[PDB]
């Protein structure tokens, strides 16, 4: 816990981390994302529950 927090209090690059590098940090992210769009469904249960979809403006 102490080391993870030390890797948290200044080691969460929430702005300039590569997007696909999340699949590098999360080994199943790549597989599931390929799996998620692969079968045909392009939606996930609340993929944006805390985010907005927005119109053109």
């Amino acid at each position: 816990l102490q080391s993870t927090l030390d890797n948290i209090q200044s080691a969460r690059p929430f702005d300039e981390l590569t997007v696909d590098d999340l699949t590098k940090i999360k080994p199943e992210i790549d597989a599931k994302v390929e799996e998620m769009v692969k079968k045909g469904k392009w939606d996930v249960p609340g993929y944006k529950d805390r985010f907005g979809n927005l119109n053109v403006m």
Binding site: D20, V33, E34, V37, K38, G40
Partner: protein, 37 residues
Amino acid sequence: MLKRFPTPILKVYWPFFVAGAAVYYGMSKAADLSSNT
């Protein structure tokens, strides 16, 4: 950045493509028969 994920349109979008091929063939035929130009 850019990847090539396995997008299934070969066994998913086959029917529309086949219909479009038939349409292109009909257009080619009408380029010689129906329109005669």
